[PDB]
Design an enzyme around this catalytic site. Structure first.
Site, PDB file in Angstrom:
ATOM      1  N   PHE A 144      21.747  28.998 -22.401  1.00 51.72           N
ATOM      2  CA  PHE A 144      20.980  29.968 -22.662  1.00 51.72           C
ATOM      3  C   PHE A 144      20.561  30.786 -21.347  1.00 51.72           C
ATOM      4  O   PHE A 144      20.387  30.422 -20.384  1.00 51.72           O
ATOM      5  CB  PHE A 144      19.460  29.365 -23.188  1.00 51.72           C
ATOM      6  CG  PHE A 144      18.324  30.467 -23.181  1.00 51.72           C
ATOM      7  CD1 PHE A 144      18.172  31.522 -24.309  1.00 51.72           C
ATOM      8  CD2 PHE A 144      17.486  30.466 -22.026  1.00 51.72           C
ATOM      9  CE1 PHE A 144      17.274  32.461 -24.303  1.00 51.72           C
ATOM     10  CE2 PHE A 144      16.426  31.563 -22.197  1.00 51.72           C
ATOM     11  CZ  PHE A 144      16.493  32.515 -23.193  1.00 51.72           C
ATOM     12  N   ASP A 202      19.590  40.146 -20.254  1.00 58.04           N
ATOM     13  CA  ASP A 202      21.052  40.877 -20.093  1.00 58.04           C
ATOM     14  C   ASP A 202      20.826  41.916 -19.107  1.00 58.04           C
ATOM     15  O   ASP A 202      19.688  42.374 -18.577  1.00 58.04           O
ATOM     16  CB  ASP A 202      21.460  41.378 -21.497  1.00 58.04           C
ATOM     17  CG  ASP A 202      20.879  42.537 -21.866  1.00 58.04           C
ATOM     18  OD1 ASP A 202      20.397  43.129 -20.815  1.00 58.04           O
ATOM     19  OD2 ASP A 202      20.588  42.759 -23.230  1.00 58.04           O
ATOM     20  N   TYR A 207      28.464  39.279 -37.256  1.00 59.86           N
ATOM     21  CA  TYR A 207      28.433  38.375 -38.707  1.00 59.86           C
ATOM     22  C   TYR A 207      27.233  37.450 -38.453  1.00 59.86           C
ATOM     23  O   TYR A 207      27.276  36.368 -39.210  1.00 59.86           O
ATOM     24  CB  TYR A 207      29.624  37.750 -38.966  1.00 59.86           C
ATOM     25  CG  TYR A 207      30.889  38.669 -38.734  1.00 59.86           C
ATOM     26  CD1 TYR A 207      31.338  39.002 -37.474  1.00 59.86           C
ATOM     27  CD2 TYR A 207      31.569  38.781 -39.873  1.00 59.86           C
ATOM     28  CE1 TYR A 207      32.359  39.843 -37.672  1.00 59.86           C
ATOM     29  CE2 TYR A 207      32.988  39.296 -40.017  1.00 59.86           C
ATOM     30  CZ  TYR A 207      33.234  39.979 -38.776  1.00 59.86           C
ATOM     31  OH  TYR A 207      34.352  40.927 -38.590  1.00 59.86           O
ATOM     32  N   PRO A 213      27.084  46.231 -19.727  1.00 63.41           N
ATOM     33  CA  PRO A 213      25.710  45.618 -19.243  1.00 63.41           C
ATOM     34  C   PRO A 213      25.241  44.709 -20.212  1.00 63.41           C
ATOM     35  O   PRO A 213      24.417  43.912 -19.825  1.00 63.41           O
ATOM     36  CB  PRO A 213      24.931  46.946 -18.861  1.00 63.41           C
ATOM     37  CG  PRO A 213      25.816  47.744 -18.473  1.00 63.41           C
ATOM     38  CD  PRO A 213      26.904  47.780 -19.486  1.00 63.41           C
ATOM     39  N   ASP A 228      35.428  44.364 -23.263  1.00 66.59           N
ATOM     40  CA  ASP A 228      34.075  44.926 -23.762  1.00 66.59           C
ATOM     41  C   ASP A 228      33.081  44.653 -22.583  1.00 66.59           C
ATOM     42  O   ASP A 228      31.838  44.363 -22.853  1.00 66.59           O
ATOM     43  CB  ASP A 228      33.483  44.452 -24.890  1.00 66.59           C
ATOM     44  CG  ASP A 228      32.763  45.643 -25.561  1.00 66.59           C
ATOM     45  OD1 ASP A 228      32.373  46.728 -24.890  1.00 66.59           O
ATOM     46  OD2 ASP A 228      32.423  45.686 -26.863  1.00 66.59           O
TER      47      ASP A 228
END
Lengths: 9, 258, 294
Positions: free
Chosen positions: C83, C87, C16, C131, C128
């Site tokens: 921050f 990832d 969203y 990676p 969930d």
């Protein structure tokens, strides 16, 4: 019934 | 899942103190009382049965209403609005499938608009600062239940029911923590159904004894004996269902002999 | 509100919303701003955002991404997180050659289990881990992130949602329709990830449910009642399932040594009850020599 505005006054 | 069983119990003990509502609260609300609240919580019970919600959602919503009302005066005409946005927050939090907002506007019999319910939803979140994961009576009962020998489904439903009964009366249930009401509820149920008492292992686990559970237990016992005469009956009706082993039809003990 | 935040660049788009990297102009802190759109006459604050904010506010741990603040307007919700520059997926697509040095795999997995053990101790399931949701900074830290699909669980748990966990990282017991799952599904995901960090490729990249299972089955053996009391009773178990034999773990992830193998092996156990737990896994000899490399 559930469908009802509750009365309190 | 006894890898984390105690850690969580501990964490919930700490959290139940932070999510406690203020005991007085109702004295500070100029236009509402403990009776209208009772009227409101009874209604959330039927809304829960109408929409088939978990009992958990029901415990959370009442916790949200109590905390919300510990810090915001509300007019009698808006109490149901608050109660409704609470139910919606609890459902979104707890339900696999929350009812839709419109359905929430619909059980009020169009008393409020979608706009007002959404705006209320948002103010409740602000006022609670999104602390929604609150320990409930349900969550303590569930853990205590692992301590049965052997499990006894009548015992389980009847504790749930007594715990649900305590949500209705702020005087005096606001003065007790969820884990304590759960102990008193678990013991009354066990004792009512099987004659057994609060077990040693729950002592090792919670640090509570019948002696420490006594007060709440004396209140919970009168509540249970008086239940047929209470102005609110939705929980009793609710608990005549076989989903709950019809436990509201059992008879309370005249004495608890402690 | 957003007075103090100068936006730097776009950093990710979500369910969203948009996420930007921004700079607080008085502390100077660099942060991630997840804009969440609302509007009224809608459905209100999305259930995912309600869960994420509330669970995240309980989880403060160095290996769990931090929600610094939440900024509310009559129209928009702004979530300010610490921050993190990358990832894990994107870091694996750049270790393409090299591959990841064992010492870093060890640090990372050990960090992740810290974070996961903290979640499970606070009655939170992530649901969930993959990676893409594992963020790493320039100091050597890795952190669980994205709690959109997370949930507060009870003890014991009850039936929770099924549409759960990105398929490749999804566990057997969910693939098999169990009515009850728990904390152990996060461990499965982490085990899938430990493999990947090693081979640099997914361990079970299936395209459908049943496809995911058979891949699983052909790698660890088709489960039976000996290995997993109850499998044959699970809602989606079928007696027509081909019966594959179990491979050596040494072939499943060839570059692993014995400790690595024994651990991955306890993370990939069929039976949720025997599957190791994040907490216990912290003590595995695989980690005797760990350090937080950069």
């Amino acid at each position: 019934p559930v469908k009802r505005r509750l009365d309190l006054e | 899942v006894p890898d984390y069983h105690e850690d969580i119990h501990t964490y919930l003990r700490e959290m139940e103190v932070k999510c406690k509502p203020k005991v007085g609260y109702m004295k500070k609300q100029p236009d509402i009382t403990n009776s209208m609240r009772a009227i409101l919580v009874d209604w959330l019970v039927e809304v829960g049965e109408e929409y088939k919600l978990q009992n958990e959602t029901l415990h959370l919503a009442v916790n949200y209403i109590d905390r919300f009302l510990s810090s915001m005066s509300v007019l009698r005409g808006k109490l149901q609005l608050v109660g409704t946005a609470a139910m919606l927050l609890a459902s979104k939090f707890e339900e696999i499938y929350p009812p839709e907002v419109a359905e929430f506007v619909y059980i009020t019999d169009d008393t409020y608009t979608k706009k007002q319910v959404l705006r209320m939803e948002h103010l409740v979140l602000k006022v609670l600062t999104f602390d929604l994961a609150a320990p409930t009576v349900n969550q303590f009962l569930t853990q205590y239940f692992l301590h049965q020998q052997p499990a006894n489904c009548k015992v389980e439903s009847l504790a749930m029911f007594l715990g649900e009964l305590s949500l209705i009366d702020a005087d005096p249930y606001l003065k007790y923590l969820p884990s304590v009401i759960a102990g008193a509820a678990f013991h009354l149920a066990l004792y009512t159904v099987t004659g057994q008492s609060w077990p040693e292992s729950l002592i090792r686990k919670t640090g509570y004894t019948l002696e420490s559970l006594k007060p709440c237990l004396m209140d919970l016992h009168q509540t249970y004996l008086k239940a047929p005469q209470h102005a609110q009956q939705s929980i009793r009706e609710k608990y005549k269902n076989s989903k709950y082993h019809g436990v509201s039809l059992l008879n309370p003990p005249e004495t608890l002999n402690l | 509100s957003m007075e103090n935040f100068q936006k730097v660049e776009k950093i990710g788009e979500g369910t969203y919303g948009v996420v930007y990297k921004a700079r607080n102009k008085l502390t100077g802190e660099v942060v991630a701003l997840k804009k969440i759109r609302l509007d009224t006459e809608t459905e209100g604050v999305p259930s995912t955002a309600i869960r994420e904010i509330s669970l995240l506010k309980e989880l403060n741990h160095p290996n769990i991404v931090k929600l610094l603040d939440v900024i509310h307007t009559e129209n928009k919700l702004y979530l300010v997180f610490e921050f993190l520059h990358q990832d894990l997926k994107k870091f694996m697509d750049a270790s393409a050659l090299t591959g990841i040095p064992l010492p870093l795999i060890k640090s990372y997995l050990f960090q992740l289990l810290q974070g996961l053990a903290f979640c499970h101790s606070h009655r939170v399931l992530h649901r969930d881990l993959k990676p893409q949701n594992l963020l790493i900074n320039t100091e050597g830290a890795i952190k669980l992130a994205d709690f959109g699909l997370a949930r507060a669980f009870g003890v014991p748990v009850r039936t929770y949602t099924h549409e759960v966990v990105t398929l490749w990282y999804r566990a057997p017991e969910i693939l098999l329709g169990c009515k009850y799952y728990s904390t152990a599904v996060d461990i499965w995901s982490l085990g899938c990830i430990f493999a990947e960090m090693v081979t640099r490729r997914a361990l079970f990249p299936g395209d459908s449910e049943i496809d995911q299972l058979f891949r699983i089955f052909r790698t660890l053996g088709t489960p039976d009642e000996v290995v997993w009391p109850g499998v044959t009773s699970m809602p989606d178990y079928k007696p027509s399932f081909p019966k594959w034999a179990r491979q050596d773990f040494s072939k499943v992830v060839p570059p692993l040594d014995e400790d690595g193998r024994s651990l991955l092996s306890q993370m990939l156990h069929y039976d949720p009850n025997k599957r190791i737990s994040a907490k216990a896994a912290l003590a595995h000899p695989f980690f005797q020599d760990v350090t937080k490399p950069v």
